[PDB]
Design a binder for this molecule. Structure first.
Ligand SMILES: COC(=O)[C@H]1[C@H]2C[C@@H]3c4[nH]c5cc(OC)ccc5c4CCN3C[C@H]2C[C@@H](OC(=O)c2cc(OC)c(OC)c(OC)c2)[C@@H]1OC
Ligand SMILES: COC(=O)[C@H]1[C@H]2C[C@@H]3c4[nH]c5cc(OC)ccc5c4CCN3C[C@H]2C[C@@H](OC(=O)c2cc(OC)c(OC)c(OC)c2)[C@@H]1OC
Lengths: 384, 384
């Protein structure tokens, strides 16, 4: 029993969750194309179903989030984390051994449930173990940076491993890593609820800004590989590599602008980030080769880093100013915003790409971001 | 008689016209203040009249512009140019000796008529003298360079000279320069009309682009000095110097982006420059000292330079692609945009500032520019 073991456990759990989220994007469209028969343009018939597949995790996470907290209060913290590891291992094995469409849907649903359980339980355990105030910050920083590390490491992993070792290599590797995390976890040892926090306009503006900024990436996952295979004629191992700028630029932007944004005002950072997201999504569907998506994706990642570094401190400041705040107050609002974006984006986006073209979806999302960007003016000098 | 005299005549005429347009900015409100009266404040009662006074030039420029063409065809070019000198000299003398509000109105009106006549006749004479189709570009370029140069030394001239020499000095100097231009002038010697060009959407979008880009500076003239004397409490000689960044930044931006815009697309330059304007007009009314306007004014000038350097070649290309083009079709389409901007901006700005607050006007203009910015996506790849 030591304070570092819980940190390493939460680190590995969040890394595994984000890696399993990201790895699926290069793999599902390629597998669905391969099972029927770069050859054919029949993917338009399946776009609504591939889009609805991705939203299952967000929908189940939203459905299961409110019940997690009371369970942790009445039966502790370790058992919900063990449940999360078991569900994650079941999800990864089901992904590895699935052959049809329904099995992948079940895998995504189970992954959503396990992710919600593991996230809430791990945050609770890290809060409970450290009781120094200042120390909690350096622990939460490392644990939350683990998510970005997993996102960076796992984006081109699946696409490269699918065409070389097979369809069951990355999922079994993630299963072994989850088994290691579970084995490590085997050796261990209030105020203003969220629905009141979402009742004031100042928090709602920030949450909507975060959701609309992340919908650029939310609706680019299930629709970009299909677009690449239909038009660009790129090989199957480069589909995951097109998302590397979206992660590297995000990490660079979040570090640099967490350093710099306090000097020139946070609302200006949010406005410029939203505008850059809109312009980047507008310029995305003009590329005729894989090298042409290096620019717009990088700009997109930089603008999302802009918004995510300029909005969280504003949310914390508002919660401290007008309500009573706890350690995880900002986390619940951020998670609700992310899940709402990931659950509303793909489900409507698939319908839009069947009804009309893929570029019109990008133009619509960019225009929505640009129109919403002026509304960040409200956040400056928030009244008590 | 030669070909380098007409160039200097058109140069001096455009230079003096722009100086007389710009030097009235910090003289009218200060004259009203020191004729009606730290300082008791009532300028909110007269802001509407001050705003309406500035629109007369644009209004009867638009009213008189259609009639100058057939007159030039029937009776030549030199006589309408000499009439411009006579009307401009009358306007500057009237500005020098005016004491009441009606005289300033009629002087501005005369300046509008003289500016329209001088501009049309001068461009006609420059086109008539040169008939090489290569040196004509340099001939227009020098005159428009003088047009740009006037607005640099026009704004921080009246404000500085007013508090040190008096109210009758700069107008008399401009009158002497006008008489010199007339003395120089004394020793001298068709397709797709405009109303059909304003019928296709691809030109109307560009015209609205230029107009809504210049409305930010159009509504900033009559209302910024009054705001400065009401809040910032600056001396009377610093009102004119607050517009120098909007001139220098505009010149720098127009040079750089005329060099650079073709590499990254003209529509993207316009889209980026219509958002810098919206942010600049939003950060303008937050300053609490004179030194806080150096940033937003420079940004506004840079964005206007971006738009004006990325839109004119688009208009020329569109007119060549879909219609029949002449020497100054882009000139006419730009004039109809500038005059509409200067005629619609100040009046409604005065009404808004007397109805709601001054900062709300800049917020509305910035929101309008941001909303209209996505519509520049249409201008890429226009069909034939
Ligand atoms: C699945 O990806 C995630 O799930 C994370 C990211 C979401 C999004 C994203 N997805 C991609 C998928 C790709 O595959 C092809 C490629 C690129 C991207 C990008 C690029 C852009 N990107 C940003 C990532 C943001 C992460 O969230 C946090 O960093 C965070 C930080 C906090 O501390 C301040 C929080 O506390 C308040 C917090 O509360 C919930 C969350 C978020 O959840 C952990
Ligand atoms: C009165 O100001 C004008 O009247 C000129 C400018 C309008 C606007 C402006 N006003 C100010 C007043 C101030 O006092 C306090 C301070 C700052 C500014 C700024 C800063 C920003 N600025 C830009 C200036 C632009 C000029 O117009 C052209 O340069 C032009 C070029 C062309 O060549 C391509 C044309 O041909 C197609 C053309 O056709 C009609 C016009 C325009 O008309 C001549």
């Amino acid at each position: 029993a030591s304070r570092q073991l819980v940190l390493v456990v939460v680190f590995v759990a969040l890394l595994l969750d984000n890696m399993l989220f990201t790895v699926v994007v290069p793999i599902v469209p390629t597998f669905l194309y391969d099972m029927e028969f770069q050859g054919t343009g029949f993917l338009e018939e399946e776009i609504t179903r591939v889009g609805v597949l991705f939203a299952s995790k967000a929908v189940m996470q939203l459905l299961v989030n409110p019940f997690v907290g009371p369970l942790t209060n009445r039966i502790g913290y370790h058992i919900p984390m063990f449940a999360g590891f078991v569900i994650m291992f079941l999800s990864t094995v089901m992904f590895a051994f699935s052959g049809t469409y329904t099995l992948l849907f079940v895998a995504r649903t189970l992954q959503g449930i396990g992710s919600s359980f593991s996230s809430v339980a791990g945050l609770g355990m890290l809060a409970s173990v450290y009781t120094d105030d200042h120390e909690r910050g350096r622990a939460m920083g490392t644990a939350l940076g683990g998510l970005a590390l997993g996102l960076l490491v796992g984006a081109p992993f699946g696409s490269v491993m699918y065409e070389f070792v097979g369809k069951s290599a990355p999922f079994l590797i993630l299963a072994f890593l989850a088994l290691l995390d579970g084995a490590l976890q085997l050796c261990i040892l209030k105020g203003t609820p969220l629905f009141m926090l979402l009742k004031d306009p100042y928090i709602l503006v920030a949450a909507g800004s975060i959701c609309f900024a992340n919908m650029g990436v939310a609706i680019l996952e299930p629709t970009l590989p299909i677009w690449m295979m239909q038009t660009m004629c790129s090989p199957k191992w480069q589909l995951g590599l097109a998302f590397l700028p979206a992660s590297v630029s995000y990490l660079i932007g979040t570090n640099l602008f967490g350093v710099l944004a306090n000097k020139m005002g946070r609302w200006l950072c949010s406005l410029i980030g939203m505008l850059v997201v809109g312009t980047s999504l507008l310029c995305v569907p003009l590329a005729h080769n894989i090298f042409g998506l290096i620019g717009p994706n990088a700009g997109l990642g930089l603008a999302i880093g802009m918004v995510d570094s300029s909005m969280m401190p504003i949310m914390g400041h508002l919660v401290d100013l007008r309500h009573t705040s706890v350690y995880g107050s900002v986390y619940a609002i951020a998670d609700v915003a992310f899940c709402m974006g990931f659950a509303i984006g793909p489900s409507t986006g698939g319908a839009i790409v069947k009804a009309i073209g893929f570029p019109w979806l990008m133009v619509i999302t960019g225009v929505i971001n640009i129109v919403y960007a002026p509304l960040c003016y409200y956040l400056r000098s928030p009244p008590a």
